[PDB]
């Protein structure tokens, strides 16, 4: 086994060894809830528990592409209701930024569309935005593909006018990979090389229920340690094995992503670095307001 003990401190010591050079992060909505952007599965607060008003056949229909193309108004109403007053990345995003700054980050595969990874300073090469982004939008006509910015989209969303393409009058959709849409080719290009050379998987803020993203946890070599930082266990059935007698590489830190990243950063000797990074960047954002 590569971990000396199945704890956060053991993962930290492994990350300080020379064997751990390439770290892949797999993140979901949980790493952004502390930024005011709700998740999907959490009781009461999750999006799937707050869609009775939109009168949908099933909660996921508001995020399914065929439903959107038939009835886009519920999605854009929900978007107006959820559009954040401020885009501030979390301590978890800035922990990934520290991984980048120290040359340890091979890739961040994110399921989120909030661009907080970019805002925290992760560059395009560092990112697999597996499910797209809200930042750009496109006409849904494949022979048109007129691109519209977040300003145009946000204006149409708050004026409660359904976004329509100025050239062919088709629907304009944010560049989110809705359910039923294919993931970008970059996902499948990166995975091929990334998961042959990964030394540590860091899974944060995801329930690991949406495919093909969840399957990524089984693409790593069997020796590669995997650390989950999440309010609840996830990815158990090559699934996650935290508790069995055969457990050897999977560690679950149950709690807030921000708290677990603070603790791991402190165990690595990065407490003050992460604090300064968060302070400076949140100040820069509050200044550019």
């Amino acid at each position: 086994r590569l971990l000396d003990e199945l704890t956060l401190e053991g993962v930290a010591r492994y990350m300080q060894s020379e064997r751990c050079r390439r770290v892949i992060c797999l993140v979901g909505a949980g790493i952004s809830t502390s930024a005011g952007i709700p998740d999907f599965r959490s009781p009461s607060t999750g999006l799937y528990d707050n869609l009775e008003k939109y009168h949908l056949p099933y909660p996921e229909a508001i995020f399914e592409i065929s439903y959107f193309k038939k009835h886009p108004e519920p999605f854009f109403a929900l978007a107006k209701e959820l559009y954040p007053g401020q885009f501030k990345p979390t301590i978890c995003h800035y922990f990934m930024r520290l991984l980048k700054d120290k040359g340890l980050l091979l890739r961040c595969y994110t399921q989120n569309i909030d661009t907080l990874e970019r805002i925290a300073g992760l560059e395009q090469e560092d990112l697999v935005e597996a499910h797209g982004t809200f930042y750009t939008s496109h006409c849904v006509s494949a022979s048109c593909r007129h691109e519209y910015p977040l300003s145009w989209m946000k204006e149409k969303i708050f004026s409660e006018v359904t976004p329509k393409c100025e050239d062919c009058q088709s629907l304009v959709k944010p560049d989110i990979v809705f359910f039923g849409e294919s993931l970008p080719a970059r996902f499948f290009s990166c995975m091929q090389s990334d998961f042959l050379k990964v030394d540590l998987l860091l899974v944060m803020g995801t329930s690991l229920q949406v495919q093909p993203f969840a399957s990524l946890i089984s693409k790593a070599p069997l020796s590669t340690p995997r650390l989950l930082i999440n309010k609840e266990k996830a990815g158990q059935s090559g699934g996650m094995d935290f508790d069995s007698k055969k457990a050897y590489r999977d560690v679950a830190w149950l709690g807030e992503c921000d708290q677990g990243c603070l603790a791991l950063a402190e165990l690595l000797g990065w407490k003050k670095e992460l604090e300064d990074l968060v302070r400076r960047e949140h100040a820069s954002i509050d200044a550019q307001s």
Partner: peptide
């Protein structure tokens, strides 16, 4: 016919 799709 297409690359793998986002599915719950």
């Amino acid at each position: 016919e297409a690359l793998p799709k986002a599915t719950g």
